[PDB]
């Protein structure tokens, strides 16, 4: 209580870099949020309902390594900076808050659960503000409700002089547009 | 101009 968060590193650089180039990923994957790296940056993504969304800022047009090979995005919006694919077997599926509750939890990277108030669809306020340096390499981190439900996806953070009052995220309604969409 | 790639994971409680 409220909602706990522990990470676990499963690659180095080295294995990184060479799943990267065959594409190919054999590990055993697990968790509610994956901690995803390309060459150049390191971000997250969440599963939701079976698809593991991040931002496409973060992920390109990229495949995601797996067991049988890249995985092919199944949805790619880029304009609402989303990408999915669909998640590999053994990841945690989370799912949807319906119930409309404005008192919402952003997971960080680091495993921090740290409270957001709704301001709207999109956008929601840091209770206590925390540095820039803090929130970076976190996109694609869920928001999730009391019960531990999903609402959307970590995007943006609204800033100054690196100090972040507030986030920017993409509603699982968006998700969902997509997917009806595509 | 890899795959990207999982390299940990977080778990929710
Ligand atoms: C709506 O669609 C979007 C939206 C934003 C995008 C984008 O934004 C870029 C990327 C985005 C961003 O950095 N998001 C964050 C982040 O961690 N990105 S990240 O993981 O480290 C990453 C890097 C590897 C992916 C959450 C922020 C953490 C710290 C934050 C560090 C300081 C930067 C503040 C900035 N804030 C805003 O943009 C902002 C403030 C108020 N409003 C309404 N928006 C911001 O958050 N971003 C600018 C970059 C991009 O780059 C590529 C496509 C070339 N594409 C974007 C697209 C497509
Ligand atoms: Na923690």
């Not at chain 1, 390594?65 to 890249?70: E, I, Q, S």
């Not at chain 2, 101009?1 to 390299?7: D, L």
């Given at each position: 209580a409220?909602?706990?968060?522990?990470s676990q590193?499963?690659?180095?650089?080295?294995?990184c870099?060479?799943t990267?180039?065959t594409?190919?990923?054999?590990n055993?994957?697990?968790?509610?949020?994956?901690?995803?790296?390309?060459?150049?940056?390191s971000?997250?993504?969440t599963?939701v309902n079976?698809?593991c969304?991040?931002v496409?800022?973060?992920?390109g047009?990229?495949?995601?390594?797996?067991?049988?090979?890249?995985?092919?995005?199944?949805?790619?919006?880029?304009?609402?900076?989303?990408v999915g694919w669909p998640?590999?077997?053994?990841?945690?599926?989370?799912?949807?808050?319906?119930c409309?509750?404005?008192?919402?939890?952003?997971?960080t990277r680091?495993?921090?659960?740290?409270p957001?108030?709704?301001?709207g669809?999109?956008?929601?306020?840091?209770l206590?503000?925390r540095?820039?340096?803090?929130l970076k390499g976190?996109?694609?981190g869920?928001?999730?409700?009391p019960?531990?439900?999903?609402?959307?996806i970590?995007?943006?953070?609204?800033?100054?002089?690196?100090?972040?009052?507030?986030?920017?995220?993409?509603?699982?309604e968006?998700?969902?547009?997509?997917?009806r969409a595509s | 101009?890899?795959?990207?790639?999982?390299v940990?994971?977080?778990?929710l409680?």
């Amino acid at each position: 209580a409220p909602i706990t968060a522990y990470s676990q590193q499963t690659r180095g650089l080295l294995g990184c870099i060479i799943t990267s180039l065959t594409g190919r990923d054999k590990n055993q994957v697990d968790g509610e949020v994956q901690v995803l790296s390309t060459a150049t940056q390191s971000f997250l993504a969440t599963c939701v309902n079976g698809v593991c969304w991040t931002v496409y800022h973060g992920a390109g047009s990229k495949t995601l390594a797996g067991p049988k090979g890249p995985i092919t995005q199944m949805y790619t919006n880029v304009d609402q900076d989303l990408v999915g694919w669909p998640a590999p077997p053994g990841a945690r599926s989370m799912t949807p808050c319906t119930c409309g509750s404005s008192d919402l939890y952003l997971v960080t990277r680091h495993a921090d659960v740290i409270p957001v108030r709704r301001r709207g669809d999109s956008r929601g306020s840091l209770l206590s503000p925390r540095p820039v340096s803090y929130l970076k390499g976190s996109s694609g981190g869920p928001l999730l409700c009391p019960s531990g439900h999903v609402v959307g996806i970590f995007r943006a953070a609204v800033c100054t002089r690196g100090v972040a009052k507030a986030v920017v995220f993409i509603p699982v309604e968006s998700m969902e547009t997509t997917m009806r969409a595509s | 101009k890899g795959s990207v790639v999982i390299v940990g994971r977080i778990i929710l409680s």
